[PDB]
């Protein structure tokens, strides 16, 4: 199957450097054109860079806002494409997607988040939300983290229906969100309900069990 594994994201101070890596598998990497695209809340969806196949001349192209600071390169023998970034600015913050083009068909990776800020990495505080009918609602409050993102699952993903994870809001220069899950009363607290909160930038994970008050 087609797969693009991305890495190298995280938090970096303004003026710093960072390299995004993308390992391709499941196709002839040397035949594909590789692209980097950025999606950010304030700059929408914008193409960043492109490098073409060896048979197409191996030419690189860059968006104007990154020309001179970003260098795209590819290693066919390792089926990898890289985006090296120098003199990173606040405008470069966003989710970067690695994409591969063969014929007209285009495949995108899951994307990794790059944050250019002077603020420091802060792990989140995860608090359970237990109530004080035929269905009950539980929650987890993820408060005071930086940077984006955090991922929230319930019971390692086995609890997928009735889950609402809300977008993060900015509070006191940190991020805060909540996740709610609605289950039948016959399942809790007779069986456990646990929220898995992951914050990759701080390499943190909290498995918070929702015990009744």
């Amino acid at each position: 199957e087609v797969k693009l594994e991305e890495s190298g994201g995280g938090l970096v101070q303004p003026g710093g450097s960072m390299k995004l890596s993308c390992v391709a598998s499941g196709f002839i990497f040397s035949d594909a054109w590789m692209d980097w695209v950025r999606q950010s809340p304030e700059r929408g969806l914008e193409w960043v860079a492109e490098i073409r196949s060896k048979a197409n001349g191996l030419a690189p192209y860059y968006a104007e806002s990154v020309k001179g600071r970003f260098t795209i390169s590819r290693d066919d023998s390792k089926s990898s494409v890289y985006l090296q970034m120098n003199n990173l600015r606040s405008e470069d913050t966003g989710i970067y997607y690695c994409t591969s083009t063969l014929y007209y068909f285009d495949y995108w990776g899951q994307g990794t988040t790059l944050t250019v800020s002077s603020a420091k990495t802060t792990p989140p505080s995860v608090y359970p939300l237990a109530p004080g009918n035929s269905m009950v609602t539980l929650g987890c409050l993820v408060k005071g983290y930086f940077p984006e993102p955090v991922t929230v699952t319930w019971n390692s993903g086995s609890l997928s229906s009735g889950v609402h994870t809300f977008p993060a809001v900015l509070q006191s220069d940190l991020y805060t969100l909540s996740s709610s899950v609605t289950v039948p009363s016959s399942t809790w607290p007779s069986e456990t309900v646990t929220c898995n909160v992951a914050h990759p930038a701080s390499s943190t994970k909290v498995d918070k069990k929702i015990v009744p008050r």
């Binding site: 914008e46 193409w47 068909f105 359970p128 109530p131 929650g139 809300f166 977008p167 909540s178």
Partner: protein, 212 residues
């Protein structure tokens, strides 16, 4: 650079209705290199229409595309719930490659009252020194809704942060979270806490409460 304009940015459609999204280019785009991406929340954009009118595998047949020169369009012959998402047009005919601003396509459905749940500050947060009271307003329609707080009967308004989800994929409803942040002292000074939801087109509100 070819600037792509998608107007309007938000569009709504009934189930089964024919829908058309437009993409206007500042200069001519070769039709072979005009494509459309679909993005649903929590997922990467997926190539939905390539070369103006061709569908990749997995894309339902009710989708089509057309256009030429500087004017293109994506069409859904019959709107379905799973078609509610963001749609971007995109050109790679002239570099730099450019995307449109995107269109959030939503589907209309029957009005629904929100399931409201209120949660007190947990003991773990009280140990640290803060106190956040949480209120979920889940699975309502339309998106317009108001929430208000009361502490021992007194109406509250400050220290409240709200967050909305996108339209759900199966029941086409919206959800909202309302968080009231206070100090441990202020929370300890009072006992009764109330979160109520009101839709302006209705009188009877949905009220939840607890006592410290």
């Amino acid at each position: 650079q070819i600037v792509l304009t998608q107007s309007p940015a938000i569009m709504s459609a009934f189930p089964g209705e024919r829908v058309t999204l437009t993409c206007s280019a500042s200069s001519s785009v070769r039709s072979s290199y005009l494509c459309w991406y679909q993005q649903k929340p929590g997922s990467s954009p997926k190539l939905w229409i390539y070369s103006t009118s061709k569908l990749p595998s997995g894309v339902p047949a009710r989708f089509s595309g057309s256009g030429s020169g500087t004017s293109y369009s994506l069409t859904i012959s019959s709107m379905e719930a799973e078609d509610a998402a963001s749609y971007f047009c995109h050109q790679w005919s002239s570099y730099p490659r450019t995307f449109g601003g995107g269109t959030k396509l939503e589907i209309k459905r029957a009005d629904a009252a929100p399931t409201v749940s209120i949660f007190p500050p947990s003991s773990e947060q009280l140990t640290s020194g803060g106190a956040s009271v949480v209120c979920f307003l889940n699975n309502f329609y339309p998106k317009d809704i108001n929430v208000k707080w009361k502490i021992d009967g007194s109406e509250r308004q400050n220290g409240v942060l709200n967050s909305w989800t996108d339209q759900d994929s199966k029941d086409s409803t919206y959800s909202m979270s309302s968080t009231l942040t206070l100090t441990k002292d202020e929370y300890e000074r009072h006992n009764s806490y109330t979160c109520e939801a009101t839709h302006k087109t209705s009188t009877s509100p949905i009220v939840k409460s607890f006592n410290r």
